[PDB]
Amino acid sequence: GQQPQNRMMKLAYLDRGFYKHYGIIVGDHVYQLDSDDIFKTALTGKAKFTKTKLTSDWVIEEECELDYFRIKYLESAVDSEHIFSVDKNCETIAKDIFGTHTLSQHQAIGLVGTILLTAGLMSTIK
């Protein structure tokens, strides 16, 4: 067997008028928070990942190389339908980021979700 090539992942968004809804394109699928309103996500403090099929409505902002073997972190987040908090600042910093041990899938996905939320919220500043 062989070493799989990295895939290009893309950060992209759907313009939803009041905000830009961000997602991670891998192949012809887009990983994103399962939310139709960034404000609801922010106020409830919780989110879940979902996957949708790539469409022409997605606007690509950035591209970069993703380790083939990390794609399943995203797939697992969707499949497990797991909720995570986006308002547990203290433990995220002290345990996850500063914990200095390879992030768990749940730790990693939590941080990715925070990034997508941050991007959506930034987009609301008109």
From Swiss-Prot:
Is not a protease. The active site is at H21 (for protein 2a h-nc), C90 (for protein 2a h-nc). Residues 11-105 form the LRAT domain. Signal peptide: none annotated. The chain holds residues 777 to 902 of 2180 of the full protein. It comes from the Viruses. Contains a H-NC box. This is Protein 2A H-NC. It is found in: Host cytoplasm; Host nucleus, Host nucleolus.
